[PDB]
Design a protein around this ligand. Structure first.
Ligand code: COA
Ligand code: COA
Ligand code: MG
Ligand code: MG
Ligand code: NA
Lengths: 229, 464, 464, 229
């Protein structure tokens, strides 16, 4: 069961899932994720990156590092094994130098994400209403303008559709200069499933699918955070 | 128990804390119970009195030779637990605790113990810190508020004390017919969900208005589930206290509670099919229209006006509420062209011009209501020299009757004292009438907002 | 030719089209003129009558042995140009043209000829297609509207005929004191700009309320320039007809014109320091408060309430208008702690509890108003059995008198028929009182909105 | 007098200014523009390119080009005296070729515009209120969401400041992720001048400064169109 990931994390006194575990968990619910492998060796990364196909992105899986980029734990666009290979040591040094307290679960090999329209799907627990799903467009629209919608879970198809249409940046989903309309149905599906994750798993205090890329066909979660309690 | 049938329709009610002194709260409640005409048994309870207001008085509820359904408790907080114990022993099912001095002044322990003790005897608690409750079908006024209300189908639930008891009086002024008034105050036990469940099943109640400051932790899901199903058949209007951040803090300290999230309450209200009013006036204007009208079957809303300016005020007000007018059906335009001049407008609003005499309101209103392709009607009147306000109003009444059907109608009338009387005349006949075109248009907008809210709920409950 | 002194203050006025038939419009105007008490000379003009209403009648204005300032013309449009020529010959300065059937029915040619010809005689035109005008300081009622209005300092200009003449009656019901009513109708010549100029210099007028459907092409810049300078001393409230896109098209069709930009009108009003009302009710509520109060000198607004609920409604409403309360001066809290219980809240609103008797409103209002760190006061009252509405009102009256200053005050009172009477009582004293806490708060917010509007204009006029 | 640009256009029956002329006209009012020169000869284009500084954009200037991109009338990122001479001849050879019947005014040498926050400043004539200034944030904020503010000209400092703070996208000017706060005083200054242009020049029917780029210090108009009547 995918619940084993939650149990393992609890047993190890951890209060969030590691990035790859979060995506496995999410994926088990039918929410599409960018493909990933956890590299336990310079050799395995380079293979996993050979396997997943190219380019790849590399970053550090550690229970101890949270904002990765400013610690130098994120390397990118690595088409050849050799292109990657320097990155494996490159990040290792950078985290060793700046987080020697940190535990190194391994290095993460991340499949590439063609650009698209970015989205946020969140799950929180409101004291009154319990598991609540939130939606908004990525970048400055959630982060700066706070343009988000909420629905108390479980979500009906009506809930999902209307909360998408509700945000001010909604027209970013229906075609604009240099961007086709994206798969609204696929967004709705993910919103509903996010709500289901909250209703069913009491051990999850919070979830953040950010960023999520919307395409004309399908969506893909690029990064996922799952907080435990 | 979860069933409140015998809270609202008790065979016997005790008033604990009534006094030889008629100024005390218990005595005021007892006085209101008798004057409003309760037909069950009333048992004044007082340590020494032999009789109060012509009724045998007892020192304890447990000494009453009868099954008491409801104990209205008006003794100081330090004596309340004692009275609960006695009520518990006597087998009382509902304790209506008037008394203040609980969670709202920081004494949490006392409130939790009040509830704990009530429940150990299977007794439910309304309150504490409330002004009581009224239920018109049982001729039961167990409040210390006004002695009377207009009878009707609106249930009003209030978490606020002072505003609640004052709005109880305001219903009379606004001609709103009441089925029930319930003060819920601190909501230590019985709360909105419990009451909504009762009013759902109550055939005397058609509309539910709630002044709501907050919902208890862990109670919100159940609230949505219950309100949702109620909204399928009965409109719920909520006056939300603290719907801005600074106001959320303002209600957080008046009540003994932390402020919940504004945005999530608003989504919950949307998922429940609930209409959120930002003001007392909006809530009462909407309650009135929802109380006296069926919901519109469709979107063919017609506005009838003798003034272009009033008609544009209405158009703007409808637009702000997401309601857009469409050209009227050709058959209606033809019906009306039989008596209006050529410089009349038919864009919707239908402008019958400023020289319209009284009877054109009768003929116009009738034609619109009788027409198969008209779903709803807003009639606007500006007082000119050629009309009489009361004549226009009687024409609207006669046209509603002669049409036979029930399509929603609202009326907006502008003018001097004669208009104020005509408006009052219409409201006393349960025709939703207002002294401005924007209020008449806002009231009709609520009828549509409710149709749309019901639809939101129906679609959300769709089977997969 | 651009001074309107003799329009509002004529020595002599002719009514052309008055008749022995008392039902005709000309006759109705003449009756209003005499019964409202005009003290100058009135000249009925009719082809055959020797006298009308005891006044000597002439068949032509040019036959009158006197200088006629104003001619009120109530003859069919096919007769108007002839009367204009005779007025022109007689040296009439102002033609007030009641008559309809000009640009609003598609006959722009006739309208432009009317203006062209009037100007050739150095005569201005008001209208055409209007119900006339009223100027209280001259005891001049030259309308066929209500025969009377409450005297005061509000000037009301209306582009709408039916809504204008109806609102004229509504001012009485809403206790609004009037200095002038001006129907401008088609605005073929004299318009809002010309009128603002006069009311700028009129010491009888302190507030200007306009019902505005549109401004003429090429006229907007002059409008901002004049209105902004008026706004420095006198508030202007505009009810804008067609403030939504949908409504702008509806107004664009009601008048015969292309649809002005909604956004640019909004900006023009902001640059003018104008308060835009979305409704009749808001416009009248604000007018009352602005007519009867000075602007606050700072942002230390106090809300005084005998119940949390009303206080939270008030707080939310103030917050929706960009007004945030801050802690009361410690001197004030100390003053009020002399009589209120310790579980009273002093966060602002100052909650003196539902147990407050009539006297605490007097003491509370007096303490707040006399305090030098308080700039404005909203008093909120929820009717309970421990008080009387009229006692609370009289307390407020006495406190305002005792304090011997003018700080803005609004009052919100919630309850039954006794509250309606108390509110009516306060408004008859020119204390802005309302039957809900949101309306009292909205009205106070209008005073702040104006102070900020005036400041906007002052800043935009700052010398580099 | 900069009015000679307007009179010249009128006499030639043109209903707009050429893009270099619009920039010169704007510049004469003290609105900053990205630096440009009109090259008469190849030797001048090279000398101008050194003056303006690399990288420069080269584009044909002629009243006949409906779309400058597709007559081979635009070369980009020219970084040397060599590349300038090369593009200076490809353009002319290609534009003479594909539109021979077209008077070549010259070739425009344009300064590189560093990236920043994009704004729109516009001027239109309202039937009621006459010359009116329009402000908005660039990209999707005006084009898709129509988040704009208007003030009737002439603008005071108060008008300019409030109309900037009024648009919903205002926070993009006060610092966000990956972008410093920009120069609001510069923006106010350009808005007021845009109003002045409209008040004074009755022959200008409308004006669009778009894109305008705002930096921590100053702003620069990248493109300007002026329509005559
Ligand atoms: C409940 C409250 C009104 C009681 O105060 P009170 O009436 O002045 O207090 P008293 O002690 O005088 O009243 C209780 C009466 O019942 C009697 N009583 C006391 N304990 C009793 C008991 N166990 N059984 C029966 N009667 C009892 C008292 O003797 C007194 O009667 P008396 O006049 O014959 O002596 C008061 O404590 C309170 O909470 N006030 C605020 C209530 C409120 O506003 N709530 C709603 C906010 S909207
Ligand atoms: C102005 C209007 C009211 C006149 O209609 P009317 O009173 O039915 O018209 P009449 O032809 O009867 O003329 C009125 C009187 O003026 C007299 N009259 C006509 N021409 C005259 C002239 N040149 N000089 C003097 N008196 C003249 C007529 O004889 C008549 O008097 P009488 O009854 O003694 O014959 C009408 O044309 C109109 O415009 N109605 C609508 C106006 C309106 O509603 N405006 C307000 C918009 S809010
Ligand atoms: Mg009309
Ligand atoms: Mg009109
Ligand atoms: Na209180």
């Amino acid at each position: 069961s995918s619940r084993d990931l939650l149990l393992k994390a609890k047993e190890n006194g951890r209060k969030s899932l590691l990035e790859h575990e979060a995506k496995y968990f999410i994926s088990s619910y039918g929410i599409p994720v960018t493909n990933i492998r956890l590299a336990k060796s310079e050799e395995e990364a380079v293979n996993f990156s050979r396997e997943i196909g190219f380019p790849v992105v590399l970053k550090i899986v550690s229970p101890q590092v949270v904002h990765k980029s400013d610690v130098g734990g994120v390397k990118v666009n690595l088409r050849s094994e050799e292109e990657v290979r320097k990155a494996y040591r490159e990040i290792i040094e950078n985290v060793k130098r700046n987080v020697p307290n940190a535990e190194i679960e391994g290095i993460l090999v991340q499949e590439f994400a063609p650009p698209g329209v970015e989205l946020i799907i969140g799950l929180l627990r409101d004291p009154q209403f319990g598991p609540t799903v939130m939606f908004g467009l990525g970048g400055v629209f959630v982060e700066l303008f706070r343009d988000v919608s909420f629905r108390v879970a479980p979500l009906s198809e009506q809930d999902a559709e209307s909360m998408i249409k509700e945000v001010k940046a909604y027209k970013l989903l229906t075609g604009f200069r240099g961007m086709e309309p994206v798969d609204i149905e696929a967004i709705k599906d993910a919103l509903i499933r996010a709500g289901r994750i909250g209703v069913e798993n009491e051990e999850i205090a919070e979830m953040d699918l950010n960023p999520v890329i919307a395409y004309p066909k399908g969506i893909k979660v690029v990064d996922a955070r799952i907080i435990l309690r | 128990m979860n069933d409140l049938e015998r809270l609202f329709n008790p065979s016997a009610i005790a008033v604990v804390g009534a006094s030889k002194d008629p100024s005390k709260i218990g005595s005021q409640i007892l006085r209101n119970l008798l004057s409003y005409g309760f037909k069950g048994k009333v048992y004044p309870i007082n340590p020494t009195a032999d009789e109060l207001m012509g009724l045998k008085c007892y020192p304890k509820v447990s000494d009453v030779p009868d099954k008491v359904d409801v104990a209205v408790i008006s003794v100081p907080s330090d004596k309340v637990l004692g009275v609960i114990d006695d009520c518990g022993k006597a087998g009382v099912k509902f304790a209506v605790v008037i008394t203040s001095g609980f969670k709202e002044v920081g004494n949490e322990e006392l409130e939790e113990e009040l509830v704990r003790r009530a429940h150990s005897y299977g007794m439910r608690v309304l309150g504490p810190n409330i002004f009581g409750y009224l239920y018109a079908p049982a001729r039961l006024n167990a409040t210390f508020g006004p002695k009377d209300v207009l009878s009707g189908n609106v249930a009003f639930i209030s978490q606020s004390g002072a505003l609640g008891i004052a709005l109880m009086g305001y219903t009379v002024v606004e001609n709103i017919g009441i089925s029930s008034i319930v003060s819920v105050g601190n909501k230590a036990d019985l709360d909105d969900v419990d009451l909504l469940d009762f009013f759902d099943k109550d055939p005397n109640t058609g509309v539910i208005m709630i002044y709501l400051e907050g919902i208890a932790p862990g109670r919100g899901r159940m609230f949505i589930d219950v309100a949702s199903r109620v909204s399928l058949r009965k409109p719920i209007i909520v006056i939300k206290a603290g719907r801005t951040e600074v106001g959320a803090r303002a209600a957080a300290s008046h009540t003994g509670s932390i402020a919940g999230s504004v945005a999530i309450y608003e989504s919950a209200f949307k998922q429940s099919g609930i209409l959120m009013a930002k003001s007392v006036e909006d809530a009462f204007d909407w309650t009135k229209a929802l109380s006296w009208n069926p919901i519109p079957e469709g979107e063919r809303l017609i506005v009838l006006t003798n003034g272009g300016g009033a008609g544009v005020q209405s158009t703007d007000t409808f637009a702000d509420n997401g309601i857009y007018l469409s050209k009227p059906p050709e058959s209606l335009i033809q019906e009306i062209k039989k008596f209006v001049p050529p410089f009349a407008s038919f864009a919707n609003p239908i402008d019958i011009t400023g020289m319209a005499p009284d009877d054109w309101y009768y003929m116009g209103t009738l034609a619109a209501l009788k027409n198969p392709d008209v779903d709803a009607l807003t009639v606007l009147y500006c007082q000119t020299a050629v009309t009489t306000p009361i004549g226009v109003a009687k024409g609207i009444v006669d046209a509603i009757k002669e049409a036979g059907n029930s399509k929603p109608v609202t009326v907006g009338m502008v003018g001097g004292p004669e208009v104020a009387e005509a408006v009052s005349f219409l409201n006393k006949q349960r025709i939703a009438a207002y002294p401005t075109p924007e209020r008449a248009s806002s009231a009709m907008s609520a009828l549509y907002a409710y149709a749309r809210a019901r639809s939101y709920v129906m679609k959300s409950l769709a089977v997969r």
